[PDB]
Design an enzyme around this catalytic site. Structure first.
Site, PDB file in Angstrom:
ATOM      1  N   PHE A 315       0.859  -1.207   0.000  1.00 42.77           N
ATOM      2  CA  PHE A 315       0.000   0.000   0.000  1.00 42.77           C
ATOM      3  C   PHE A 315       0.886   1.245   0.000  1.00 42.77           C
ATOM      4  CE2 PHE A 315      -3.684  -2.409   2.283  1.00 42.77           C
ATOM      5  CZ  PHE A 315      -4.158  -2.874   1.076  1.00 42.77           C
ATOM      6  N   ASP A 407      -6.765   3.688  20.134  1.00 39.42           N
ATOM      7  CA  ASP A 407      -7.873   3.700  19.151  1.00 39.42           C
ATOM      8  C   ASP A 407      -8.368   5.139  19.094  1.00 39.42           C
ATOM      9  OD1 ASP A 407     -10.463   3.759  18.001  1.00 39.42           O
ATOM     10  OD2 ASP A 407     -10.760   1.657  18.491  1.00 39.42           O
ATOM     11  N   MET A 408      -8.547   5.692  17.897  1.00 37.40           N
ATOM     12  CA  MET A 408      -8.828   7.149  17.784  1.00 37.40           C
ATOM     13  C   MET A 408     -10.125   7.483  18.525  1.00 37.40           C
ATOM     14  SD  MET A 408      -9.878   7.570  13.836  1.00 37.40           S
ATOM     15  CE  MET A 408      -8.578   6.533  13.170  1.00 37.40           C
ATOM     16  N   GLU A 423      -6.412   7.647   6.318  1.00 30.43           N
ATOM     17  CA  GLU A 423      -6.468   6.849   5.067  1.00 30.43           C
ATOM     18  C   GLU A 423      -7.320   5.604   5.326  1.00 30.43           C
ATOM     19  OE1 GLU A 423      -2.741   4.977   3.788  1.00 30.43           O
ATOM     20  OE2 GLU A 423      -1.784   5.354   5.762  1.00 30.43           O
ATOM     21  N   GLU A 432     -14.773   0.573   5.357  1.00 28.86           N
ATOM     22  CA  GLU A 432     -13.777   0.242   6.413  1.00 28.86           C
ATOM     23  C   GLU A 432     -14.167   0.985   7.687  1.00 28.86           C
ATOM     24  OE1 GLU A 432      -9.703   0.326   5.052  1.00 28.86           O
ATOM     25  OE2 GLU A 432     -10.242  -0.831   3.213  1.00 28.86           O
TER      26      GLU A 432
HETATM   27  N1  LIG Z   1     -10.373   3.329  15.123  1.00 30.53           N
HETATM   28  C1  LIG Z   1      -9.074   3.318  14.781  1.00 30.53           C
HETATM   29  N2  LIG Z   1      -8.181   3.864  15.639  1.00 30.53           N
HETATM   30  C2  LIG Z   1      -6.879   3.858  15.297  1.00 30.53           C
HETATM   31  N3  LIG Z   1      -6.302   3.374  14.197  1.00 30.53           N
HETATM   32  C3  LIG Z   1      -7.206   2.844  13.338  1.00 30.53           C
HETATM   33  C4  LIG Z   1      -8.600   2.780  13.559  1.00 30.53           C
HETATM   34  C5  LIG Z   1      -9.160   2.113  12.421  1.00 30.53           C
HETATM   35  C6  LIG Z   1      -8.126   1.789  11.592  1.00 30.53           C
HETATM   36  N4  LIG Z   1      -6.924   2.226  12.141  1.00 30.53           N
HETATM   37  C7  LIG Z   1      -5.613   2.132  11.527  1.00 30.53           C
HETATM   38  O1  LIG Z   1      -5.726   2.737  10.261  1.00 30.53           O
HETATM   39  C8  LIG Z   1      -4.770   2.142   9.340  1.00 30.53           C
HETATM   40  C9  LIG Z   1      -5.474   1.754   8.059  1.00 30.53           C
HETATM   41  O2  LIG Z   1      -4.604   2.119   6.989  1.00 30.53           O
HETATM   42  C10 LIG Z   1      -4.908   1.770   5.704  1.00 30.53           C
HETATM   43  C11 LIG Z   1      -3.784   1.786   4.856  1.00 30.53           C
HETATM   44  C12 LIG Z   1      -3.923   1.478   3.540  1.00 30.53           C
HETATM   45  C13 LIG Z   1      -5.189   1.162   2.996  1.00 30.53           C
HETATM   46  C14 LIG Z   1      -5.367   0.846   1.633  1.00 30.53           C
HETATM   47  C15 LIG Z   1      -6.603   0.531   1.180  1.00 30.53           C
HETATM   48  C16 LIG Z   1      -7.671   0.528   2.093  1.00 30.53           C
HETATM   49  N5  LIG Z   1      -7.560   0.822   3.370  1.00 30.53           N
HETATM   50  C17 LIG Z   1      -6.317   1.149   3.843  1.00 30.53           C
HETATM   51  C18 LIG Z   1      -6.154   1.459   5.214  1.00 30.53           C
HETATM   52  C19 LIG Z   1      -4.113   0.987  10.110  1.00 30.53           C
HETATM   53  O3  LIG Z   1      -2.834   1.413  10.561  1.00 30.53           O
HETATM   54  C20 LIG Z   1      -5.068   0.732  11.281  1.00 30.53           C
HETATM   55  O4  LIG Z   1      -4.419   0.353  12.476  1.00 30.53           O
END
Ligand SMILES: NC1N=CNC2C1C=CN2[C@@H]1O[C@H](COc2ccc3cccnc3c2)[C@@H](O)[C@H]1O
Lengths: 625, 303
Positions: A315, A407-408, A423, A432
């Site tokens: 990615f 976690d955010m 992202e 997502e």
């Molecule tokens: N509630 C949350 N609190 C903190 N951190 C969170 C979170 C939900 C997700 N995360 C974090 O977000 C990152 C996702 O990154 C991508 C990277 C590349 C991608 C390509 C295509 C599609 N989707 C993609 C998503 C991850 O590092 C995950 O830990």
């Protein structure tokens, strides 16, 4: 560069004939397994007791050869749908006899013709064969682009050819195939060997066939034109079609006798080879996607699954996305910071779902190029990814902390933020759970803060693909609903498909969600004008997002960001294919549903005919919060 | 005892055709075995056929003989599986057989071939659904017609007018043709047509046989009788003034009929498909048949 065999209906000496063909540059030979004029009586004496061997010995080649170089052809006299009974019966026997020999030899494939409208008893004999013993010969249905009837010479005085444009009456050979494969419940062993005539139909027909399992194109010598030098060639219209087929990676079959005599017979092949050499070489995306053609996968769930190191690595190799993100932050910094405040005012920037830090690097890059000052936070719930961040932090930073593992939605910020960068987007944008994640984090955004991305919108389009329909069919698992596989989205590089109407937008989300209540559920009704008759097998999903002002990313095909491979189309299947007639509207309805623990999609077709509601109560598919 | 001929003639006898002087022509294909080809034979003695040792001349064709006919007295016109029409001619001594031409023109098996009354032209029909007209003198195709929408089952030249001929096909059309019309073909109103014979004393009349074993009678300016249990393969009129109708079928039987189609003869002498018949010039009560059982049979027909 291109795989191609030779059709013959006359083989005096299988040894020498195969060799001649090999000398010519061919890769396989479609030939008869019995002599095409050797007609056989199974029931009435004396003819039923015809002595001696029914065909030539299997010893005549290596098993290797049989497995690789030969394609079987059903004798032309075999007519299982004859109006005469005796014929219909001898035909039933003959067919099983020929297919059974083809199995004995381990033939890679076998040719059967669709050349009339009623192939019901033929379908049925082949269905019994497929369910008799254990064998994996492929079945190639020889179906013409145009019925021999509809390109006969207009030379019968009392029976003239129709000078009217009949819309159905020049689509008729597809219904033949459709009806046949439908009767065989879409067996994955039954494919199309598509025959090309001198006249082509309108381009609507040509769109129809792509999205059908074409394993072979058949070019008669007779359609070839001649150039200055006296060599075989094709019209611009026939070539455009060849290019379209090469894209589907079909096999090419030269049939009939040598019409360009002085110029040899390996020359037709060379024109095909020449055409293959001279088409545009694949782009970055296309080079990257080679292998993933029509390969169904589960969409990623980074919220409730921790992504792998190598999943993050690929990615990060996406050129355009992080370049767009950098640029978006640069504009924002300029808009937020006046020149006279260049060093008095420093921006509070928070990356949410910071991963291994590609958005962090983007922020650094933006800070420099905009000549503005930022204070950076990195929020990451994946502890395996946090290890990457903290090593780099420790080795190259020491400036406070902020790689803060949390976690955010959970995290308690030490101060409110100017800008929040994420992202969290999926192939269907909100799938997502970007909405729910950012709504949690919203409270630490400043009352006049900016979120990147600021807003995103998902798009759907109805599709026809008998290949993808089977791919989903084969995801049927034990220990779960037998039709569960139809009630979940797949991420897939759609290849062998037909897009029946233009994409239209489904669900849109803005950040921040300024208003109160902030319900994240939705129900949305969409209507698709359908230009051809067709079969609906499901719906493509795409998305676009507004990072900041004119800065966008998009997988919508018309506006697709160039060479961005981080997302692929999503697919929403439907349990039962719905027939569509030209002019009809396709009406689909999509719901986004949720509770405390999970978010999911339900969807339904209301026009022209109704579908069962899919994934009710997220019973087959949910996204974990 | 064969001169420049082959050791063994193929098992599947396809054609049998007397000429002016009472000599017998034999076409043979081998439709099963290592080697799928065909052969041609003259028997100056009919009674010795099919003895390789007692033949007058014979030769090997690259591939299978689907149909042939005579071309006057020295000439043999052939339909190869190769997609070729072949013209072979006897040497001066009538002891060799020699390929004059073999043009590969059809995109599939050539299945039928008839000589036009001129003798300088012939017409062949194929599984590629294309009917073509050949000038034998110039060895070229003058015209190629895709009238039909299916395999061309059978073509028969007019005995008299050298621009007229019948054709029938799996697409269930019988066609009357005149090369002198801008649209040279005409459909002529169930089961598929399988064999075609012109009446020899009426420019105006002809018989067809269907896949069901019904023989039918027609003049363009319908009378029928179900003769057979399986498809009619062949129909050859005798030489007599008021002439008899020999019919032959995949049911391994031979009938001879009168002008009203009433049956006057029967022979299950054959034990495999009956594939041809031809009446003698030296006798008009002598009927000769050949079938896939390898039997040349010489029937005496009461009249
Ligand atoms: N509630 C949350 N609190 C903190 N951190 C969170 C979170 C939900 C997700 N995360 C974090 O977000 C990152 C996702 O990154 C991508 C990277 C590349 C991608 C390509 C295509 C599609 N989707 C993609 C998503 C991850 O590092 C995950 O830990």
């Amino acid at each position: 560069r291109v795989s191609s065999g030779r059709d013959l209906n006359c083989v005096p000496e299988i040894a020498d004939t195969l060799g001649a063909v090999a000398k010519q540059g061919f890769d396989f030979l479609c030939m008869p397994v019995f002599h095409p004029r050797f007609k056989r009586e199974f029931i009435q004496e004396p003819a039923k007791n015809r002595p001696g061997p029914q065909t030539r010995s299997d010893l005549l080649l290596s098993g290797r050869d049989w497995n690789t170089l030969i394609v079987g052809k059903l004798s032309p006299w075999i007519r299982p749908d004859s109006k005469v009974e005796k014929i219909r019966r001898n035909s039933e026997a003959a067919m099983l006899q020929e297919l059974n020999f083809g199995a004995y030899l381990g033939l890679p494939a076998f040719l059967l013709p669709l050349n009339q409208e009623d192939n019901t008893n033929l379908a049925r004999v082949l269905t019994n064969h497929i369910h008799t013993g254990h064998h994996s010969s492929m079945f190639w249905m020889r179906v013409p682009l145009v019925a021999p009837e509809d390109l006969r010479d207009d030379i019968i005085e009392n029976a003239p050819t129709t000078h009217t444009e009949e819309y159905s009456g020049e689509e008729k050979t597809w219904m033949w195939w459709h009806n046949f494969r439908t009767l065989c419940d879409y067996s994955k062993r039954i494919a199309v060997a598509l025959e090309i005539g001198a006249d082509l139909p309108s381009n609507h027909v040509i769109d129809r066939w792509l999205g059908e399992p074409i394993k072979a194109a058949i070019l008669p010598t007779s359609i070839f034109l001649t150039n200055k030098k006296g060599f075989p060639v094709l019209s611009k219209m026939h070539q455009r079609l060849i290019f379209r087929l090469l894209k589907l990676e079909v096999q090419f079959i030269i049939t009939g006798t040598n019409h360009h005599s002085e110029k040899e017979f390996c020359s037709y092949l060379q024109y095909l080879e020449y055409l293959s050499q001279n088409r545009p070489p694949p782009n970055a995306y296309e080079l990257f996607a080679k292998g993933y053609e029509d390969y169904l996968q589960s969409p990623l769930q980074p919220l409730m699954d921790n992504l792998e190191s190598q999943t993050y690595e690929v990615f990060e190799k996406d050129p355009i996305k992080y370049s767009q993100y950098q640029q978006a932050i640069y504009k924002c910094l300029l808009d937020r910071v006046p020149e006279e405040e260049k060093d008095t005012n420093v921006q509070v920037l928070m990356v949410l779902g910071a991963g291994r830090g590609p958005l962090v690097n983007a922020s650094l890059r933006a800070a420099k190029q905009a000549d503005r000052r930022i204070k950076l936070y990195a929020v990451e719930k994946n502890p395996n990814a946090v290890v990457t961040l903290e090593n780099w932090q420790f080795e190259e930073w020491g400036s406070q902390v902020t790689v803060v593992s949390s976690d955010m939605r959970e995290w308690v910020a030490p101060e409110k933020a100017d800008i929040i960068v994420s992202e969290l987007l999926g192939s269907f944008a909100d799938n997502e759970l970007s909405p729910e994640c950012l709504d949690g984090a919203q409270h630490f955004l400043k009352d006049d803060g900016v979120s990147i991305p600021g807003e995103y919108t998902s798009f759907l389009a109805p599709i026809s693909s008998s290949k993808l329909y089977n791919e989903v069919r084969a995801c049927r698992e034990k220990d779960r609903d037998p039709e569960a596989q139809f009630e979940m989205p797949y991420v897939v590089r759609l290849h062998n498909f037909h897009q029946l109407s233009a994409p239209q937008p489904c669900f849109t989300f803005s950040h921040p969600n300024r208003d109160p209540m902030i319900d994240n559920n939705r129900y949305c009704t969409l209507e698709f004008p359908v230009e051809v008759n067709t079969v609906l097998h499901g719906f493509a999903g795409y998305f676009e997002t507004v990072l900041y002002q004119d800065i966008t990313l998009s997988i919508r095909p018309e506006t697709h960001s160039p060479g961005m491979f981080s997302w692929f189309p999503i697919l929403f299947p439907i349990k039962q294919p719905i027939t569509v007639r030209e002019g009809q509207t396709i009406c689909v309805r999509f719901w986004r549903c949720s509770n405390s623990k999970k978010v999911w999609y339900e969807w339904a077709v209301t026009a022209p005919v109704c579908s069962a509601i899919h994934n009710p109560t997220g019973r087959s598919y949910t996204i974990g919060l | 005892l064969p001169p420049n001929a082959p050791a063994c003639m193929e098992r599947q006898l396809e054609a049998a055709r007397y000429r002016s002087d009472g000599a017998l022509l034999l076409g043979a294909s081998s439709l099963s075995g290592r080697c799928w080809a065909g052969s041609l034979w003259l028997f100056k003695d009919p009674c010795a056929a099919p003895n390789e040792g007692f033949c007058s001349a014979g030769v090997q064709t690259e591939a299978g003989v689907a149909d042939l006919t005579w071309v006057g007295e020295r000439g043999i016109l052939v339909a190869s599986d190769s997609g070729a029409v072949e013209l072979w001619e006897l040497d001066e001594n009538e002891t060799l057989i020699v390929s004059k031409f073999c043009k590969y023109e059809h995109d599939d098996i050539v299945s039928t071939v008839s000589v036009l009354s001129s003798g300088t032209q012939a017409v062949s029909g194929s599984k590629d659904i294309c009917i073509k007209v050949w000038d034998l003198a110039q060895q070229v195709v003058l015209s190629s017609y895709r009238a039909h929408a299916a395999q061309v089952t059978c073509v028969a030249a007019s005995p008299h007018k050298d621009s007229v001929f019948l054709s029938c096909s799996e697409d269930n059309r019988i066609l009357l043709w005149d090369t002198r019309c801008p649209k040279p073909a005409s459909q002529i109103g169930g089961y598929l047509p399988t064999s075609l014979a012109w009446h020899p004393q009426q420019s105006e009349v002809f018989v067809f046989g269907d896949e069901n074993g019904t023989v039918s009678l027609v003049d363009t300016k319908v009378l029928s009788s179900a003769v057979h249990s399986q498809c009619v393969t062949g129909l050859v009129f005798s030489p007599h003034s008021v002439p008899f109708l020999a019919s032959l079928s995949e049911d391994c039987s031979l009938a001879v009929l009168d002008s009203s189609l009433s049956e006057l003869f029967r022979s299950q002498a054959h034990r495999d498909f009956v594939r041809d018949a031809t009446w003698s010039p030296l006798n008009h009560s002598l009927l000769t048949t050949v079938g896939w059982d390898h039997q040349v049979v010489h029937h005496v027909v009461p009249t």
